[PDB]
């Protein structure tokens, strides 16, 4: 029994620290004189029993008792930390029986009125101190969600930095003890040899256990081990499979030479009698067409004027996430309109007394707002969690309730509010975290700060107020060294309305018309005077009649069809015009004793089956796109197929009539190797061009999966707008992204079974419980912010030691007011039966009985569980409860791939709870459901179309060889466009998907006419494959290139000044790529493939 200090020598004039004095080792005190009874139960535990000798007085016991009485409510959550904490201080202070302090040096006064030990050291084991700190490094607080370790170690994250926190302080005396390391010649064995450890417990490997919300060990060590397929490989799976499949062929290709029915055959009796019907009474055909135009343009102007401007065109109705979105709105209100304003110092920190003297005027002038329309105020439209609550505003001015200027002491108060947001509460009891309103954590060196204002009232007067707010938000001033940025809900809508001016589209169609008319006019003398005008008017009549006919069935018309349906129907219609006309003008040279009517009947009997074939392939390709989830493409497919069939019937009825009438009112006296003819010698290079397009196809098919998915609303904001700076500020200065709410649909009363699946801060909670699972997901998923668990807070509201709030007078089931500051009312639960052991609280009627009292009063004196935090958090049923939500947030989500990953997390987490009925809601979730299936949907849709093209082409051609060649070319053109999407920065979303469908349609269009002409024309022909290839080019190829050149003129004219970035990305580059790739595959690859196929 050798000690290091004993005697309690010296006293002190005030403050009752009553400090102890040192002593030598050769000293043994008499003990057990009823101090051991007091030293056992109420201080540092019953581990000891009949301890032979101790080293502390009764005075030091009661001083140690009161010291630990102050510190134990701060640590009582995790029992292992509390126990080894008390065991530490007891083995130090009183159990100096075993020498746990050595080499005392400085005593204030040797034996005078001030004889005490100060500034002395202690040895200790590193393993022991590490296991002690590991069991205490992350601990939440009792009255709040703050880190209790942060109260006892600062921003420690270090055991030695936590040891030195214990060195010197205002309470009793600072001794600065802890010095762990003793590397060389400590002392003799058992004589001053001294290491320290007493079997330190932890959360695990111990009969005691803490919570997962507290301790990292209590969480599932089997954090989800399968982790899901990362879906990305250092080797691209599909690309590597493509490479090796081509390479095993690449070896062999060099080593193997290193060694009765006439249904569709004579269907043209129905096309004959229609044409013969078109030339007989053609005037009424033209009259009926031109009058039906008046009828439909009428319908469109008066009826179905709506143009489906709302965002309900992208989202699929009857889907999971849409039903979930409505279920959110009906119970928890709608998502608040957000108005975020950035204030930023470029190259430096923002916070200065001048900036506060500036925002002094701003925070209140925005409660005035430039005398808006009929005096609408922010206080009159704000967000109120309760009707008597004040208007909320997120800004560090609410750390000071608006009472902003404290010139002498603002830095410290702001550091206090940043680290410890409690006791920094605004007019509303809702606290504020720095990451939500600051770019960087250390506020004094933060490059920017975020002031966010939100509203609840979702109709058009709030938007008229925002229209009033912007003009003066632009007219507001700024210092020379400061920057600002801002945004509101209707900003993007107005930026879409801003650059809607595209006269370029009008002049584009102008140039297309001027060329399209100028076709084959001066071959055999001046001709073609106003015949192209008629065909263009009939083509336009097709889309107007379709638009009116489908507004008859009350069908919505998107902005997308306004650019696609004209572009598509023109591209096909003028192509049929040039085929019909040129075939007539060639019949005028062979056997001109055929009258004009027999000229056009013979032309229709030759080529109308090609039109029907192209039409069936396209319409089937468009009906496949009808079996889709979202209506933006569904309405497209209906519009498309119906506009195609209206054009396919008018250009073979009405245009046939106007052709007859035009060539009959003119006398047209007929009297008859050019440049287009000179390219017949180039075809001797058969194999080269096919290898070129084969490498073109293989290279495109390898780069095929590098296309990005999505669409960024941030791109489209026009140049020199007030939002281009805003998104760059969000990319760098905003720390929190979209909020996520976990909603549980329908449960009963707390039966203590259901709650063990949601409780986090307690011992008797499942491993698979909600808060613990979300804690282990939060380390690695898109959600980083901790969650608002009102059940843990509602149960922490009734613990007696941290209650100045829950009180009642006589067990009367009637509480005592918060404006009643008196001790006459006692705690709601017994100081002993507070049931921390298990998840303990009322289950039936008494659970609700205390729940209504919990949200009865706010939390100003007792800052825990007011009405303001969780007023709208749960739609409580009168009998038990209905639903409730638990909010959290995302890490900022800057990229579009981040948005997609955020959603796939929002779907993988909800599928982790087969026990419960829950789901996740974020405003943007309903918009990104498409991308989870868009890849395979593209593959299914296109491949289905291609195989359907194969079937229909094999039907009309009555042969599979040429039809397969058609299918191979049309497959190839899409692949090449897909890689060219990757290269041209085109994102893959619904918009570009529709345009790829019409790519497939037009690609089909080009090729069908040629491959139909590869069928024999027995009069004046050869069965020689190359010979009818030359036929297909000098007959149809010239007409095809003359329907191509105009569709190229559109691209070039569009590009010159179409400033709409979304139009310039997804429509110019798409279409330009389409016409180029498809013309090169149709004019070059197709003829070489066919001629070399037949070449034998
Ligand atoms: C944030 O905005 C403020 C306000 O415009 C700017 O702070 C500037 O910080 C620099 C560097 O600390 C100051 O330079 C110093 O100026 C004194 C003269 O008072 C000179 O003797 C020192 O040697 C040093 O160069 C500068 O004065 C200060 N600006 C003003 C108006 O006082 C800056 O734009 C941002 N803060 C940064 C860059 O730290
Ligand atoms: C925002 O919510 C309120 C819900 O009423 C609407 O704003 C305005 O609210 C005041 C009352 O707070 C209404 O004034 C009252 O109108 C009645 C006639 O209806 C009149 O007899 C009273 O003397 C009083 O003036 C006011 O009508 C109402 N609307 C407007 C335009 O001022 C408003 O409907 C909501 N905002 C939006 C954008 O929907
Ligand atoms: C709309 C979503 C999808 C995305 C874009 C939103 C981003 C910002 C605006 C989000 C991110 C976190 C959000 C957030 C965090 C916390 C709270 C407290 C809560 O009691 C009301 C909502 C409120 C006040 C909102 C405001 C809007 C914020 C700041
Ligand atoms: C204490 O310090 C002295 C030096 O004063 C040193 O010689 C000794 O080894 C240290 N430990 C003990 C117990 O004396
Ligand atoms: C909710 O309360 C109603 C009465 O207001 C009760 O009929 C109903 O059963 C409750 N819902 C439950 C228990 O799921």
Curated annotation (Swiss-Prot):
It comes from the Eukaryota. Gene3D superfamilies: Multidrug efflux transporter AcrB transmembrane domain. Residues 501-661 form the SSD domain. It is a multi-pass membrane protein. The chain crosses the membrane at residues 240-259, 285-305, 500-520, 529-549, 560-580, 611-631, 642-662, 689-709, 937-957, 964-984, 991-1011, 1036-1056, 1070-1090. It is found in: Vacuole membrane. Disulfide bonds join 3-55, 9-21, 44-90, 56-94, 78-210, 81-136, 203-215, 212-219, 382-391, 417-424, 759-765, 805-862, 806-828, 816-825. This is NPC intracellular sterol transporter 1-related protein 1.
